[PDB]
Each structure stands twice: as C-alpha cells, then as structure tokens.
Design a protein around this ligand. Structure first.
Ligand SMILES: NC(=O)C1=CN([C@@H]2O[C@H](COP(=O)(O)OP(=O)(O)OC[C@H]3O[C@@H](n4cnc5c(N)ncnc54)[C@H](O)[C@@H]3O)[C@@H](O)[C@H]2O)C=CC1
Ligand SMILES: NC(=O)C1=CN([C@@H]2O[C@H](COP(=O)(O)OP(=O)(O)OC[C@H]3O[C@@H](n4cnc5c(N)ncnc54)[C@H](O)[C@@H]3O)[C@@H](O)[C@H]2O)C=CC1
Ligand SMILES: [Fe+3]
Ligand SMILES: [Fe+3]
Lengths: 383, 383
C-alpha cells in the first residue's frame, strides 16, 4: 500500500496570507514564534504577515537567525528562542532553510530527547506531533510547506542529513505569490529548476505510482510553462510557479526523488552551494544517465515542456526532454558547469562517495555505482 | 484565494487497512467505536478490520444501525452508543451513509450544543474538532473519507440537509479495494457513476480552479477506464475505481458540484432512492443542459472517456461526452428513467423547488430556474 501525507489545510493564490489570522483564531493559538531570516525581515516580507497579525491582536515573537543550508547550530539557537518565547505554535516564513529549521524546532520542542539534532536523522522515532506549524513559502520553491522531509547541515561532519517524520507536517500552508515577487530573477530561476527537479525526479522515482505520476506531470507542465515569464517578472507566471512548486511537493514528499538531490547535497555541505543551482546544473546530466530506465515518461516530459513529440521515436523524445532542460537552464541564466559555482575537481571522489551514501539516491530509477557518480560530476564540471 | 481541505494521512491500494493498527498505536488512542451497517457486519467486511485490531490488542465497540440516507434518528442512536462506550476515536466502515453518520457523531460528541442534529446544517459554527475519525470506504464511491460535507435526512421535514465543517475531516483514510470487492455489480455501477458525477460536476463547477481541474480530469479518466471492468468483477479495475473515486473527492469537496447532486437529494428525501442511481440517471441530462457554460471541458471529458476527438469540433465533442455517459449508464445496467426507480410525476413541482433550494445547486455553471429543473426531471422521468 502507498501512503500520502498532505497538508490538512492549504490556502492558494495572491492574498492567501490574508487567511492566517482567522486560521489562528479558529485554532485558539495564543502566541507564534515566526522562524525566518534577516533578508525577509529586511525586505519587508515578514511584515506582510506581522502587520496583519498586529491588526488582529495576535501575539508573535521572531527568530531571524536561519542561514541558507541551516546548520545544527541554527536549529539549537531557534530551539532556545522557542522554549523561552512561550509560543504555542510556529509560523515558517521563508524558503527551504527557515521551513526545515521550523520543522526541526517544532519536533524537538515536543520531543525534547532529540535536542542534539543528529538523532532526528532518518525515520525519526518521535512519539509526539510537532508543535503546530503554519508554513508560508517565499521561494518557488522547495515545497517544504507540504513535505515530511527536512535537511540539516552537520558542519563538523561536512554532510547534509535528511529527517523524515509525518509528525513534522505543517497544519496549514499559505501559498501566496505576493510573498515571492521580491525574489531576484536568479533566485526565481534557481528555485524554479529546483521545483522542476523535484517534479522530474518524482515522476521517474522507483516508488512512483498513479497519483504521484498525475501530480508530478501536472507540476512539470505548470513549471515549464511559467518559469521563463516569472524570471522576466510576469505576475500571473509568478502565481503559476507558486502552485507548480507545491503540486511537485504533494508527489515527491510521498515517493522520493533520485540522484540529482543525492549529488546536490554534498555540494551544499562542502561549499554551501544553493540547493536549486546545484540541482539545475546536475538535472539534465542525470536525466541523460537515467533515460533508459524511464519507460515512455521522457516523452510526457518533452510534450508538457512544449517539444513537438508527434512521430519522433522514443530515443529522440528522451533527448528532446534533456535538451528542453538545457535550453530552460540557459534561458533563465543558470550557469552551465559546476566549476562556475565554486566546485573543485579534487573533491569529486569524496563528493561521489557522499552522493552514493545519500538516502535520496535510493529513489534513482537506475542503480548508481561510485564510478558512475564520479563520471557524472566530471560531466557537469566543465566543457 | 482558494482553500483545500484534504486527509493529512491516506493509505491507497489492496491491503491498505493493513496500516490501521500501526496508525492507532502511533496516535495513542485507547478504544474505537466502529460505525457501520448490518450488511457489512453480515458479509464479514467489518471483520477484515476487527480481526487485525484484535491481533494488535486494540479495544473496539460497534454501532451497526446506519441505514442508507442516514436519518436524524440514526445519528442520535450512534451518538448514544459513542457517549456510553468510552471510545476516544471513531472508525467509519462503509459507504457514504456510515461515513456521514460517523462525521455527525464525531462533531456532536465534541460540540454538545449541536446534538439536536438539525443545527449542524450549512457552515456549522463548531468550536472544536470532531472526535478523530479513521475512514475506511466500502463503496467506490462517495469519497466521504476526504470530504468536509455530510448529508443527513430530516424525516419529519422530508429533506436531505448538507453540513460543511473542516472540523469533520478524517485524520486517516484507508482506500482498500479488498473492502469493496463484495459490492454487488449494481452497487459498483451506482457508486461508480456517483464518483463519475462528482468528478464531472467538480470539473465544471463555478468555483473550479487549476488544482481541482487537474484532480477532476484525472479522476474522470480513471473512472471511465475502470468502471465497466470493475462491474464485470476485474480485480485491478476494482483498485483503479477505489483511487478514482477518492481523487474526485479531493477536488469536489473543496470547490463544489452542481445541479445533479442538487436534484438527486430531493429523490433521497422523498423516496429513499440510492444517491448514486439518482445521480447516474440525472447526470447526462444535466450535462446536456450545462454544455454551453463549460468552455472546452466536455472535449477533455470525451477524450478521457475514449471518444476519438482528433479532428472533431467542440459542438460534436460536447454531444459525444453526453453520449459516452448515456452509453456507460446502459453498459453497467443503471435504469434509464426516474419512473423505473419509484419517482412520481405528481411530486416533480415539489422536488424542483427542493432542488432549487439545495446548496449544491449554487455550483452549477448555468443558473437554474424552477421551470428549468421542472423540465429536467420531466426529461429524466420516462420515454
Ligand atoms: N524540506 C524539504 O523537503 C526540502 C528541503 N530543501 C532544502 O531547502 C533549502 C533551500 O531553500 P530555498 O528556498 O531554495 O532557499 P533558502 O531558504 O536557502 O533561501 C535562499 C536565500 O534567498 C533569500 N530569499 C528567500 N526568499 C526570498 C524572497 N522572497 N525575496 C528575497 N530574498 C529571498 C533568503 O533570505 C536566503 O538568503 C536547502 O537547505 C535544501 O536542502 C529542498 C527541497 C526539499
Ligand atoms: N459525504 C459526502 O460528501 C457525500 C455524501 N453522500 C451520501 O452518501 C450516501 C450514499 O452512500 P453510498 O456509499 O452510495 O451507499 P450507502 O453507504 O448508503 O450504502 C448502500 C448500501 O450498500 C451496502 N454496501 C456498502 N458497501 C458494501 C459492500 N462492500 N458490500 C456489500 N454491500 C455493501 C450498504 O450496506 C447499504 O445497504 C447518501 O446518503 C449521500 O447523501 C454522497 C456523496 C458525497
Ligand atoms: Fe530540492
Ligand atoms: Fe455524491
């Protein structure tokens, strides 16, 4: 049997954070800890929420110490703030980094034996649900608001580790493009191809089944249709991306991804490479590696990405899907090589071992060896 | 902004009730009231759940007094059992009737100011969540396990009233075709076209948007592909129908349906007509009435119902969709006229007024007058 964890309550569309004060009142919560970063405070994005909260007379404190690729230290700092704040719920405002941080705080806060943070890794044997989380994405996106995974950086060990826990699922997600319009184009592009990577790896993952297939192929269609326009600054394209990134989550959270996420995590841990950029560069190279274990599914990808696949045989359609992703990466200004974003040749053997041992690699529809991952990094390295 | 209420946790596939004992233990519940009917006790379908529960050492009581089109009297009997049982949670085993009954008991049981049952009608202003509900459908189906609506019969007033409450959403749904194989073919057919009706009315409802559209058109595809085979007794067709009926719910619960449900509720209340059979007879007639306010959407329906649309104008495609539903109704043995299932000509004026006042009618993409609903019943009535 296949399990689906989803958000019990989700609000979709420009103005969706408009619903938050009434959700909080109907739930009887008394005080929020908002988990976010200095940038979203600075740019006035957190204020879009706190202004409404203040107008409704709802108490909030704020932790803004989250850094991209959130570390064990960030989780413990935020945990310390929550525990002294008196908060009875959490509001995650940000991308993956604040949202994963918020999941770790919420879990540890109702399961205090996990406050070392490392022991949460894998299928966390938590007894209690997370402190309730209201999740507000500001990137488009990691789909953190609807996934049961969160990823934390162990600095001492130089590795991103995955915590998977149904207890961490947010009680409400607010998917509101107003909260996303301030993303620089490069951030829209990087988080866009992240979303696309989720949808494409979810579509072809070992555990894929009819429902996740339907969700994933619709998310690829929405993302491929909207990203160029969103990066260009189109309003409706921004709103489409907010939805597409989410729908991808509904799928990949429940069945997994593959070697792209597997190979992107070591780059995060070694170099602090943004997750989306690492995914964007690796995606077409890994799709080429996977092509022969994906049945007719690349034909579907090619079609929804606007390639005329009528008549074109399966081998040509598989290549047109890989090329449509190369073309998207170029069109939205993602650098094409790992060397352009600070990766070192010398590190590839160690990166490849960490990629092979990454839990996300298990979902890849083609069995990867150390030497295959070594070769793949070398292919993404430089011309 | 658009809201989605879904199941936080759902298990899909043959053997899905296999997960119930683990879900109960993880949740720390002490004692279930199972809400069901004498038929599912008699046919040994309840035992498929209680045998696993007994093997896991889990306490259960049982209320088996639910009748099709569950009355106020059934809700109060079940309420009385729950309140004296000591149960801390509910397991709904059945079709719409036990599942809607279980939602009413769960709500009333944590919201004692609604125990008259009539006051729950509409957007019930409940303060408290329902007693937690684990939902196990045995028909394919009403999608009750995932909807926020429930429908109760006021015998004295001769009317089905709709209660809409996010507090009633089941904590976990187990969608397990093993629990559905015992349905007589006529019940598979009647609940099948119910599922199809939900998906088609959801697809064209006034509140329809991108997410519900994707869910609905995928559910029409699954249902139209599997129903004939399921009615014939095909195993995999049965499993497909279990999924399709659910996916339809994920949509229509969150945006609504239309005039088919609106006109079927009076038949329930006047005659105790099965819901699905009334939906099946009315569906193609209402679809023809709606055709011109459905954009390109009947062309989508025609395609996924296996009509060759390659070089077909939208007018012809709209008619082929109406005809594909007539053809399905014939092939699965649904009587074609309202007169064949015990409706009276003399009642049509009163039925039409009750249909017009039914809250479900509001979603219809074409504004219905009394005269239009009168005419529609007359069209479905006889040769
Ligand atoms: N929880 C899960 O299931 C998943 C986890 N992840 C994790 O998510 C993280 C990546 O999160 P992302 O959203 O890609 O970025 P992020 O949350 O790391 O943020 C990147 C940077 O963009 C800035 N930023 C974010 N939103 C902005 C906005 N609206 N306007 C202006 N600046 C803004 C932030 O302040 C930050 O400096 C990684 O740690 C990755 O491992 C990725 C996918 C799935
Ligand atoms: N909750 C919601 O949002 C919705 C509500 N409904 C409600 O659902 C009700 C109709 O529910 P249905 O599921 O169509 O039927 P039902 O639950 O009323 O049952 C119909 C008959 O079939 C029998 N049966 C059910 N499963 C069986 C199985 N596996 N094997 C043998 N016999 C079986 C039952 O014992 C019963 O006698 C109506 O009262 C309607 O208003 C309908 C759809 C949506
Ligand atoms: Fe990702
Ligand atoms: Fe129905």
């Amino acid at each position: 049997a296949n399990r689906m964890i989803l958000n019990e309550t989700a609000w979709f569309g420009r103005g969706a954070v408009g619903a938050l004060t009434d959700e909080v009142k109907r739930r009887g919560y008394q005080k929020a800890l908002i988990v976010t970063d200095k940038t979203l405070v600075q740019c006035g994005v957190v204020a879009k929420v706190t202004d409404k909260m203040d107008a409704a007379g709802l108490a909030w404190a704020i932790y803004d110490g989250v850094v991209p690729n959130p570390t064990i230290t960030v989780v413990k700092e935020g945990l310390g703030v929550f525990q002294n704040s008196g908060a009875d719920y959490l509001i995650a405002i940000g991308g993956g980094s604040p949202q994963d941080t918020c999941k770790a705080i919420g879990i540890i806060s109702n399961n205090p034996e996990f406050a070392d943070v490392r022991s949460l890794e894998g299928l966390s044997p938590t007894n209690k649900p997370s402190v309730p989380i209201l999740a507000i994405p500001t990137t488009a996106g990691t789909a953190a608001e609807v996934t049961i995974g969160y990823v934390i950086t162990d600095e001492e060990k130089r590795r991103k580790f995955v915590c998977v826990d149904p207890h961490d699922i947010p009680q409400v997600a607010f998917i509101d493009a107003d909260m996303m319009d301030g993303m620089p184009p490069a951030l829209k592009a990087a988080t866009g191809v992240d979303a696309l990577t989720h949808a494409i790896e979810g579509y072809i993952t070992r555990g894929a089944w009819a429902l996740t297939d339907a969700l994933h192929i619709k998310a690829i269609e929405i993302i491929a249709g909207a990203l160029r326009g969103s990066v260009a600054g189109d309003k409706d394209a921004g709103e489409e991306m907010a939805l597409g990134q989410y729908v991808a989550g509904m799928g990949f959270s429940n069945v997994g991804v593959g070697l792209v996420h597997g190979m992107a995590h070591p780059l995060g841990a070694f170099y602090n490479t943004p997750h989306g950029v690492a995914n964007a560069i690796l995606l077409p190279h890994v799709m080429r590696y996977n092509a022969d274990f994906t049945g007719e599914k690349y034909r579907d990808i090619a079609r929804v990405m606007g390639v005329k696949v009528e008549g074109m045989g399966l081998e040509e359609a598989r290549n047109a899907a890989v090329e449509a992703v190369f073309a998207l990466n170029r069109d939205v200004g993602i650098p094409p090589h790992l060397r352009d974003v600070g990766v070192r040749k010398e590190d590839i053997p160690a990166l490849a071992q960490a990629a092979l041992d990454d839990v996300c690699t298990g979902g890849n529809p083609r069995e990867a060896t150390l030497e295959d991952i070594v070769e793949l990094y070398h292919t993404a390295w430089t011309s």
